[PDB]
């Protein structure tokens with residue numbers, strides 16, 4: 134009997150199966166939700182090895198007829214977003230946009246966004262849902278600023294993410310409708326009469342005065358979607374940790390300069406990644422004790438690696454004072470997250486404002502009664518109800 | 522081994538267990554989520570008997586120390602809402618508020634609300650989530666109008682419902698904080714300096730010039746919460762039915778006057794009641810083959826009764842042309858829903874607008890991949906993504 138993948142939408146503890154997989158068969162043949170077979174890689178050493186070995190290809194996971202962990206929901210070129218951004222002279226604009234340093238006002242602006250959202254929740258009084266009342270609008274605001282578009286339509290745009298990042302056994306009429314829906318939105322913002330001036334779109338506008346609208350809007354849409362969903366989901370998991378372990382919040386209030394280390398450890402700990410990092414083998418590769426064949430699917434289990442005791446002592450305990458923390462929460466090798474610094478900044482600023490404004494933050498009900506979203510690329514609570 | 526209750530969260534087909542219980546043990550001892558035991562009553566004849574026999578008591582289900590299907594989340598007096606309303610001389614004001622005929626404008630206004638919400642979704646284009654974009658704002662609008670309060674804070678109020686109607690094994694801190702939070706909101710509206718003149722709070726403000734502020738606000742909050750959550754959840758189920766069975770939408774387009782019968786049948790079919798109707802036996806009672814003892818919990822499984830083939834031929838098939846339809850979707854006996862006519866009007870007007878405005882309505886992905894909300898009094902999809 135082949136073990137099933139994915140593992141468990143419960144995101145507040147490591148799935149027992151992840152620990153058993155890493156200890157017993159750190160390169161394991163599993164059945165994905167499509168019915169296809171894959172190798173699931175669950176130890177830190179083998180995970181890191183896959184990500185740093187370019188005979189394991191991310192681009193080719195989107196090719197027709199290769200085994201899949203779930204149905205493609207975007208055009209196969211978009212999975213190669215970073216390849217297309219490089220070959221079209223788009224890297225500079227993208228890289229500059231993904232720099233917390235190129236937006237000298239960004240930090241103070243995110244801080245004000247965080248505080249405005251929390252002041253509203255404080256006005257109404259507890260309980261409140263920190264997903265709809267905080268992480269969702271906060272992440273949407275950030276990526277609206279990244280693109281240079283207003284935040285007016287953030288509810289609609291985050292609703293597009295609710296469809297775009299669905300994990301489905303088979304493709305489903307709508308992923309494409311949903312894609313072209315928000316592609317059209319991005320094309321319109323880019324071709325507006327007072328041509329857009331700030332953000333990614335502004336750089337795009339100048340760029341084509343010296344690449345198609347479709348490609349430009351594709352890069353804007355996929356950056357918005359991937360970034361808003363990944364930051365919002367990570368922040369929710371970080372909040373759950375702070376609510377469940379109030380001594381961590383006491384540490385952050387007493388020693389604000391530790392926010393960088395803290396978020397780095399929360400990143401190691403966090404289970405927001407609800408699928409694995411996929412690669413197609415371009416060649417036969419011996420990995421651990423398994424001979425992987427050219428053309429087979431490889432799945433890197435980030436939470437397997439980030440909780441591996443060979444690398445992280447007491448991996449199951451959050452620890453803001455680890456000597457070393459070489460976690461894989463942002464991936465590694467060629468496709469290491471190009472927005473890691475922004476992801477860190479986004480979460481550091483939100484949690485700093487959170488522990489200051491809601492010092493008695495706690496969950497409104499037992500953590501085991503949170504509703505964890507099914508069938509989605511991210512693990513997240515549908516609602517995050519808290520008291521303070 | 523005792524069968525577990527509740528049955529299943531998936532709301533688009535009758536749980537197979539409901540048909541098995543009804544056929545083999547229509548009065549069945551079950552283990553509720555609290556660990557308490559109860560008698561689950563799942564055939565039509567015995568369901569209706571329980572509802573019409575007043576030695577099965579609703580008010581006493583809230584008593585300290587009685588067996589429970591889930592933790593009390595409101596003050597125990599509120600389970601006796603209608604009792605308190607009748608004894609405090611509030612019945613006339615309440616029933617006048619719940620009468621669609623007493624609000625001669627209500628029909629045209631509900632139609633216009635439904636159209637504005639659908640036009641907004643047409644503006645943006647498919648896909649859309651008809652829960653957040655349609656059934657939630659529409660139901661909150663109606664119940665804001667019922668109370669005489671603005672709709673400004675409807676997301677906050679609907680979010681209070683997300684906590685109030687949770688089913689928990691044990692009491693949780695959020696329930697009481699949540700309750701008094703929105704009790705105070707209602708008190709604030711009732712005691713505004715421009716004293717309220719419209720709706721239930723207008724009728725209340727007059728009444729106390731001729732019962733405390735707390736009781737008045739309690740009735741307002743319980744009616745908002747119960748009515749909004751119940752109409753929103755039913756309407757979501759009816760939409761699924763029209764999306765899954767477009768011949769039904771074709772029928773409503775071709776013959777709009779059948780909307781009343783259609784909604785009557787959708788009510789029989791609908792699985793929005795996600796728990797059972799609770800009663801405590803006040804005396805020993807022989808129900809079917811089972812001797813029920815004084816003090817024991819009795820649970821009326823509405824969908825068991827409404828799908829009973831002894832009463833409803835081909836119960837699994839929606840049918841707008843049934844000779845008879847004496848369904849229990851509003852309950853029966855002394856606690857029959859006092860707002861049945863309003864619930865029907867609410868759904869009729871929304872669904873008439875829906876099949877006119879979205880003639881090609883269909884689900885955006887397969888029905889089996891809808892996310893059904895866990896741990897809630899209602900069965901409902903977390904998102905209702907559709908195309909048109």
Ligand code: HEM
Nearest residue numbers: 215356359360363364367410462463464467468470472476
């Ligand atoms: C806490 C936040 C985030 C986490 C946990 C995270 C994590 C990751 C991971 C694990 C990868 C590697 C995937 C692989 O190798 O297959 C990745 C790649 C990527 N991420 Fe994120 N991410 C975050 C935020 C963001 C933000 C804010 C953006 C954009 C605005 C972004 C854009 C990208 C892009 C474009 C790639 C693809 C890189 C490539 O293919 O070379 N991420 N991220």
Ligand code: HEM
Nearest residue numbers: 603744747748751752755798850851852855856858860864
């Ligand atoms: C489609 C919508 C609705 C459905 C399916 C529904 C269903 C029901 C059912 C089955 C009961 C009986 C519960 C029991 O016997 O324990 C009930 C009672 C009740 N409902 Fe409804 N309901 C709906 C709408 C509404 C609305 C719109 C309001 C208020 C504005 C409302 C207020 C009440 C009240 C106050 C009771 C308690 C009556 C008593 O205890 O005697 N309902 N409802």
Ligand SMILES: O=C1N[C@@H](Cc2c[nH]c3ccccc23)C(=O)N[C@H]1Cc1c[nH]c2ccccc12
Nearest residue numbers: 206207211212214215297298355356358359510
């Ligand atoms: O830029 C990308 N690079 C890869 C890897 C990747 C980066 N960030 C992710 C976040 C989740 C899953 C995969 C990725 C990819 O696969 N796609 C896009 C992002 C994206 C935009 N909309 C989407 C809908 C569905 C899936 C991915 C995307």
Ligand SMILES: O=C1N[C@@H](Cc2c[nH]c3ccccc23)C(=O)N[C@H]1Cc1c[nH]c2ccccc12
Nearest residue numbers: 594595599600602603685686743744746747898
């Ligand atoms: O008026 C009531 N009468 C009974 C029966 C009842 C009517 N409508 C329901 C809808 C769901 C469950 C029970 C009922 C009751 O129990 N309470 C309230 C309604 C209510 C307001 N807030 C709540 C939070 C939690 C549970 C109930 C309520």
Ligand code: HPA
Nearest residue numbers: 363406407408409410510
């Ligand atoms: O959750 C994720 N899964 C896979 N690849 C990713 N790249 C960024 N986030 C993710």
Ligand code: HPA
Nearest residue numbers: 751793794795797798898
């Ligand atoms: O869903 C419900 N459950 C129990 N009692 C109810 N009264 C109205 N709706 C409900």
